[PDB]
Write an enzyme that holds these catalytic residues in place. Sequence first.
Site, PDB file in Angstrom:
ATOM      1  N   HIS A  42       1.862  11.307  -7.257  1.00  0.00           N
ATOM      2  CA  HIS A  42       0.468  10.978  -7.428  1.00  0.00           C
ATOM      3  C   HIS A  42       0.243   9.512  -7.301  1.00  0.00           C
ATOM      4  O   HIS A  42       1.196   8.738  -7.166  1.00  0.00           O
ATOM      5  CB  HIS A  42       0.034  11.401  -8.845  1.00  0.00           C
ATOM      6  N   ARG A  63      -1.882  11.009   4.498  1.00  0.00           N
ATOM      7  CA  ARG A  63      -2.597  11.628   5.639  1.00  0.00           C
ATOM      8  C   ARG A  63      -3.640  12.632   5.099  1.00  0.00           C
ATOM      9  O   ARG A  63      -3.358  13.398   4.181  1.00  0.00           O
ATOM     10  CB  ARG A  63      -1.614  12.324   6.578  1.00  0.00           C
ATOM     11  N   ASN A  88      -5.428  11.662  11.900  1.00  0.00           N
ATOM     12  CA  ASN A  88      -5.089  11.872  13.307  1.00  0.00           C
ATOM     13  C   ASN A  88      -6.215  12.772  13.805  1.00  0.00           C
ATOM     14  O   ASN A  88      -6.460  13.833  13.210  1.00  0.00           O
ATOM     15  CB  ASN A  88      -3.706  12.559  13.403  1.00  0.00           C
ATOM     16  N   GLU A  96      -3.860   3.536   1.533  1.00  0.00           N
ATOM     17  CA  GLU A  96      -4.166   3.674   2.955  1.00  0.00           C
ATOM     18  C   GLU A  96      -4.335   5.155   3.250  1.00  0.00           C
ATOM     19  O   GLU A  96      -3.431   5.939   2.980  1.00  0.00           O
ATOM     20  CB  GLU A  96      -3.015   3.127   3.806  1.00  0.00           C
ATOM     21  N   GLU A 110      -3.750  10.419 -11.015  1.00  0.00           N
ATOM     22  CA  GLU A 110      -3.521  10.319 -12.453  1.00  0.00           C
ATOM     23  C   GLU A 110      -4.411   9.226 -13.011  1.00  0.00           C
ATOM     24  O   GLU A 110      -4.364   8.069 -12.562  1.00  0.00           O
ATOM     25  CB  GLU A 110      -2.035   9.984 -12.686  1.00  0.00           C
ATOM     26  N   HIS A 131       0.819  -1.215   0.000  1.00  0.00           N
ATOM     27  CA  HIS A 131       0.000   0.000   0.000  1.00  0.00           C
ATOM     28  C   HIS A 131       0.842   1.250   0.000  1.00  0.00           C
ATOM     29  O   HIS A 131       2.042   1.196   0.243  1.00  0.00           O
ATOM     30  CB  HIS A 131      -0.994   0.064   1.219  1.00  0.00           C
TER      31      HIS A 131
END
Lengths: 129, 127
Positions: A74, A9, A60, A56, A122, A5
């Site tokens: 990208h 964030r 937070n 992923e 993309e 993966h």
Amino acid sequence: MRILHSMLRVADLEAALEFYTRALDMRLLRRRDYPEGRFTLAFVGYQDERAAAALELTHNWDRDGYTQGDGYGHLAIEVEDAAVTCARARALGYRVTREAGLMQHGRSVIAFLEDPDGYKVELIQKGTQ
Amino acid sequence: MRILHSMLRVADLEAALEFYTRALDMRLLRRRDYPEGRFTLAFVGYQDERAAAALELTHNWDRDGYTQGDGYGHLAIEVEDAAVTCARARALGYRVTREAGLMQHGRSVIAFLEDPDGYKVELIQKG
Ligand code: NI
Ligand SMILES: [Zn+2]
Ligand SMILES: [Zn+2]
């Protein structure tokens, strides 16, 4: 060995998931919210994590945003028709930064979207890559 | 639809390739100069691009470095034996960091390798 993966964030996980699932037809593979660590992880993609690399997304709970630099590029996705995927994003109110068309010096049909946090996606039309 | 690749910009392509091919045993699948745009692309991975997502590396000829933000996280790779991969990376002079207590990784201690541009590679032991 395999690639599992890529992790990004996000400021608002629900806004992020809405983009990946609605505009891009990914599915939520797994989500984990840890009140002990005050963060949530969400894995989105097209195939089971056991079978392919996923995206992923991390949030937070006590952070309100992140600073983007110019190192990260990208995430590229293979699509049946880039103009159709762009038109879907636009209709949903998402940013198309480069409309489907031939790559500057090539024959691949490419487009670029931006997710709610501004990360670049993309789109590469199948067969043209 | 499928994920094709994640792209990272690299200051020195040869240094970046040395890391991904030697420390991580990736294969150089494709590489191409684009003289009109003054960049070179390289694609590294474990499987053929038609079968799986790869890592795209962009080297802009007129750049010496990049400004990293705090949004990008890491790339995770599945390995046979993390201890062997860490030892191999350290022997090659790359930084290895280990994190204990990560709630999403149960009882596992997770190793991260740092590439030449400072990007983190998470090692997930198979099984
Ligand atoms: Ni790309
Ligand atoms: Zn990870
Ligand atoms: Zn992790």
